[PDB]
Each structure stands twice: as structure tokens, then as C-alpha cells.
Amino acid sequence: GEELFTGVVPILVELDGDVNGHKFSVRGEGEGDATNGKLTLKFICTTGKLPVPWPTLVTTLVLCFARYPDHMKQHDFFKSAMPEGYVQERTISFKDDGYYKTRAEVKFEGDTLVNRIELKGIDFKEDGNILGHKLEYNFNSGNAYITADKQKNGIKSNFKIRHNVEDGSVQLADHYQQNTPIGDGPVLLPDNHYLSTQNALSKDPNEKRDHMVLLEFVTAAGI
């Protein structure tokens, strides 16, 4: 599926979520430039105030736009499953607090790459950093390690995100991740490698709704 990603591709992201029983919705749009591993997106909470901090949703809210160097083309599972796409599931455990469970489908609809997500949040503390909105509006660079899962004909990943808390401490979020193709055509199963990421969060000054402007770079390495 790499031929689908040679130019700038429009992106649509749709998340329906439920944290401690409170429902919310997020809608995002922008574009991706896999040649440079670059993502540009704006997200809106369409139901009102977002009940969790925006930084906790970044990883949930399209790894097919990662820049895989020419010599790593054979380890790019994400593009290889396209256009039918893949299912991406995660558990995200916030240390000393609740956890997210997410199931998403990432696939083309026409010329648009769509990420459509169901999220459940369970056992969060009313006075914790999530429901209490105590996390700084920023995001730290990191690496995410990719390993093949032959039994499922997909990949797996685990990694740690560290969210800056407004008092100066750090809130760890352990990610466990599993990806499986939607179609039954052949996909590329990679050798071990990792993805290196940079992120910049900002605000639209003309936007009155609760929102997040996001720019992200993702590059494959380690082989």
C-alpha cells in the first residue's frame, strides 16, 4: 500500500468515548505527509468540554504516516495493510489511576485516511490528574518499539508516555498495543525496530470550542 502515501493525504479522525460513564466525542481533520513523516491535525470536542486532558488522547488520536527510510520499506506493516486497513487496540494504564481501552479502525474511505475510535475509561479517580485536569498542555518526544506477531499476522508494541503534571511531577501511562489487518491479503511482518516521535501542541486563536492543534513527526529507525 505504499503507493497510496506518496503525496499529501487528507485525514479524518472520529472518537466516541466514555470515561467513568460520561460520554464525549472528538472530531479531527488535517493531512499527512508520509514522505516526511509529518502530521498536521486540528481536533474538536463536539459534545462540550473534553472530560480528560487533551495530552492523554494524543496516542489514541495513524502510524501509516510514519516515514520508513527506503532501506526499511519491507518492515512497514502499517502501509502494507492499506487500503483495507488494520484494527489497532490498546490498553493505556495511568499509574495510580484508571485505564483506557481503545479499539480503532484505520482505513481509506475514498481519498481520505480515516481513524475511527471507540474508547472506554474505567476506574479513574475524581481527584486524580486525569479527571482533575492537572496535566500540562504539552507532549514529550519518545520511541515506540515494534515487534511482529505472526500468530495474528500483525504487530505488537509497548511503550511508556510520561505526562508532565502541573505540580512538577510526572504521570506515567503504560501503553500496550496490538494491530491486526482488516483484509486477508498479504501484509509485511517486520523485523524488530522502533518509531521516533516529536509532537507540538497548540491552540487556534479563532476557535471557541475545546480543541487541540497538533503537529507530529514520526520516523522509523533501529535496523
- The answer to whether position 1 is within a domain reads no
Q: Do 32 and 65 meet the contact criterion of CB atoms below 8 Å apart?
A: yes
141 part of a folded domain: yes
User: The CATH number of the domain where 109 resides is what?
Assistant: 2.40.155.10
Amino acid in the structure at residue 215: L
Q: Given in angstroms, what resolution was this structure solved at?
A: 2.0
How many distinct structural domains can be found in the chain? 1
Q: Which amino acid is at 194?
A: Y
- The method of structure determination was X-ray
**Tally of CB atoms within 10 A around 63:** 22
Residue 2 inside a domain? The answer is no
Report CA dihedral (74, 75, 77, 82) to the nearest 10 degrees.
-30
Distances (CA, A) of 172 to 39, 150, 161, 166: 24, 30, 6, 14
* CA–CA gap between residue 54 and residue 217 (Å, rounded): 18
Cα angle value 9/58/155 (rounded, 5°): 75
Residue-range definition of the domain harbouring residue 21: 7-221
Nearest alpha carbon to residue 99 among 199, 18, 13: 18
Say whether 63 sits in a helix, a strand or coil: helix
φ and ψ of 216, to 5 deg: -140, 140
> Cell for 174?
503504560
Are 101 and 77 spatial neighbours (Cβ–Cβ below 8 Å)?
A: no
Give the DSSP letter string of 12-57. EEEEEEEETTEEEEEEEEEEEEGGGTEEEEEEEESSSS-SS-GGGG
Distances (CA, A) of 67 to 6, 32, 176, 188: 11, 11, 22, 16
d(CA 158, CA 147): 9
The Cα 200–Cα 195 span in angstroms is: 17
Cα 111 from Cα 100, distance rounded (Å) = 30
Q: What would the 3-class secondary structure string for 109-142 be?
A: ECCEEEEEEEEEEECCCCCCCCCCCCECCCCCCE
Q: What share of the chain is helix, strand, coil (3-state, %, to 5)?
A: 10, 55, 35
